């Protein structure tokens, strides 16, 4: 989940 958001941003 954390990684997904870092990637999105």
Kindly tell me the burial class for residue 9, based on how many C-beta atoms sit within 10 Å of its own C-beta (0-12, 13-18, 19 or more): exposed
Listed resolution, Å: 1.1
Helix (H) or strand (E) holding 4: helix 2-8
CA separation for the pair 8, 6 (Å, rounded) = 6
Rg (CA), the chain: 5
Tell me which method was used to determine the 3D structure. Answer: X-ray
Structure tokens at 4: 């997904």
Structure tokens at 7: 């990637």
Structure tokens at 6: 């870092």
User: Max CA-CA distance within the chain?
Assistant: 13
């Amino acid at each position: 989940l954390a990684a997904a958001l870092c990637q999105a941003l």
